[PDB]
């Protein structure tokens, strides 16, 4: 799994760049008023492109640890919520959710990092898990509520955005927990890398599809 993990970091680098350039190029296919979420999506993929290059270099030198992923997540996880809010909200409601969901997302990642940087199964490990998991549930519940007012083709397009996050993000807390039940550290890195490509490029593509619906 060592060679596979390193090779997947390179695959992710290419995938994230491909997503960045796809989203930037496609941004003109929607009306200006509907582009902001597409641009944010492209920025998320570009940040992850930058970080997978850093994480591959760290792997080459033997200095890699899972904690390096958190430098990416602490910026990209809040921004992914923002890219959803950019297609679902306007005005004061947008500013309020960006603030509240962004704070929650940062707390989730920081609490996770506190637990990540301790021995697995330690008190700190569980403390970080409980706080991050509560925040995660709070975020997922607020994402489920976001669809309540949409109709027609926007409701369908939002359903896809919501479900990619609801299903696709389960792996992150699952991977955090699994090593206390079994020898799962190695497969955790493989699955997180695959998941990041699906979640980041996929969310951008689905935000673009929503913006196409809104423009049409
Ligand atoms: C030895 C290596 C084995 C590796 C084997 C592959 C593992 C891939 C895991 C990915 C986790 C994330 C998967 C996320 C999928 C979510 C899909 C979804 O819900 O998509 C909804 C969308 O609306 C549709 O249009
Ligand atoms: C850390 C490296 C980041 C690299 C980013 C390259 C791609 C930029 C994409 C969109 C720019 C506009 C974003 C506006 C919000
Ligand atoms: C923030 C947005 C504004 C700025 C956009 C600048 C675009 C450059 C991207 C990084 C290219 C260099 C990546 C170097 C990785 C080195 C490494 O880790 O090896
Ligand atoms: C270090 C972090 C700097 C960026 C902080 C971004 C702060 C975003 C605040 C959003 C808000 O005011 O709501
Ligand atoms: C907007 C800001 C949101 C809150 C963001 C942080 C959330 C709190 C969790 C951990 C503290 C930060 C990490 C502490 C790491 C300590 C490592 C150690 O040595 O223990
Ligand atoms: C996998 C792609 C298909 C979507 C899978 C998730 C669907 C889902 O979670 O649906 C819950 C429903 O919205 C409850 O009201
Ligand atoms: C682009 C990368 C993404 C979307 C990463 C998402 C990360 C999380 C949702 C992580 C959440 C965690 C918990 C819910 C509990 C354990 C600690 C974390 C940080 C792994
Ligand atoms: C271990 C379990 C950790 C999660 C418990 C907290 C749940 C928070 C629910 C938030 C509701 C919006
Ligand atoms: C990592 C764990 C991933 C879990 C995948 C769950 C798939 C759910 C399929 C759709 C069910 C709808 C209720």
- Give Cβ neighbours of residue 142 (< 8 Å, ≥ 6 apart): 97, 101
Q: Ligand 2, from 26, 43, 73: best to mutate by most atoms within 8 Å of Cβ?
A: 43
For helices 36-61 and 185-215, the axis angle rounded to 10 degrees is 160
For the CA of 49, the nearest ligand:
2
- Which residue, by CA, sits nearest to atom 11 of ligand 9? 167
CA–CA distance, 38 with 86 (Å, rounded to integer): 9
Please identify which residue in the block is written with the tokens 């913006």: 211
What is the distance in A from the centroid of ligand 9 to the CA of 215?
31
- Would residue 118 be called left, alpha or beta, if left means φ above 0 and alpha means ψ between -120 and 50 degrees? beta
Please identify which residue in the block is written with the tokens 């003109």: 28
Residue 49: helix, strand or coil by DSSP? Answer: helix
User: Using an 8 Å Cβ cutoff, are 192 and 173 in contact?
Assistant: no
Nearest atom, ligand 5, residue 111 CA: 9
CA–CA distance, 110 with 70 (Å, rounded to integer): 8
Neighbour-count burial for 154-164, b at 16+ CB within 10 Å, e otherwise: beebbebbbeb
- Give Cβ neighbours of residue 194 (< 8 Å, ≥ 6 apart): 8
- Answer whether 156 contacts ligand 1 (Cβ < 6 A): no
Nearest atom, ligand 9, residue 174 CA: 1
CA–CA distance, 77 with 8 (Å, rounded to integer): 21
Residue 165: both structure tokens together: 């996050």
Neighbours of 141 (CB within 10 A): 10
- Which residue, by CA, sits nearest to atom 13 of ligand 9? 167
Residue 42: helix, strand or coil by DSSP? Answer: helix
CA–CA distance, 131 with 88 (Å, rounded to integer): 27
User: Using an 8 Å Cβ cutoff, are 201 and 16 in contact?
Assistant: yes
Instruction: Using CA atoms of 106, 39, 25, 194 in order, give the dihedral in degrees to the nearest 10.
Output: 10
**Fold type of domain 3-216:** Rhopdopsin 7-helix transmembrane proteins (1.20.1070)
Instruction: Kindly list the domain boundaries of the chain, sorted by start residue.
Output: 3-216
Q: Residue 191: in which H helix or E strand, if any?
A: helix 185-215
Ligand 9 neighbours, Cβ below 6 Å, are 167, 170-171, 174
Nearest atom, ligand 4, residue 98 CA: 13
Neighbours of 67 (CB within 10 A): 11
User: Using an 8 Å Cβ cutoff, are 1 and 186 in contact?
Assistant: yes
For the CA of 168, the nearest ligand:
1
């Amino acid at each position: 799994m060592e060679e596979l993990t390193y090779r997947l970091f390179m695959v992710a680098t290419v995938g994230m760049l491909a997503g960045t350039v796809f989203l930037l190029a496609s941004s003109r296919e929607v009306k200006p008023e509907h582009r902001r979420g597409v641009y944010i999506s492209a920025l998320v993929c570009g940040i992850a492109w930058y970080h997978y290059q850093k994480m591959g270099a760290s792997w080459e030198s033997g200095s890699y640890d899972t904690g390096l992923r958190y430098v990416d997540w602490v910026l990209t996880v809040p921004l992914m919520f923002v890219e959803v809010l950019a297609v679902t909200r306007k005005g004061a409601a947008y500013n309020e959710a960006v603030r509240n969901w962004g704070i929650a997302a940062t707390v989730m990642i920081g609490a996770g990092y506190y637990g990540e940087t301790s021995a697995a199964g330690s008190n700190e490990y569980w403390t970080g898990f409980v706080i991050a998991m509560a925040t995660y549930v709070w975020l997922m519940r607020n994402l489920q509520a976001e669809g309540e007012g949409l109709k027609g083709d926007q409701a369908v397009a939002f359903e896809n955005i919501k479900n990619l996050i609801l299903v696709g993000w389960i792996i992150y807390p699952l991977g955090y927990i699994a090593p206390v039940v079994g020898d799962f550290d190695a497969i955790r890195e493989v699955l997180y890398t695959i998941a990041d490509i699906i979640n980041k490029v996929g969310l951008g593509v689905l935000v673009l599809q929503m913006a196409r619906v809104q423009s049409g």
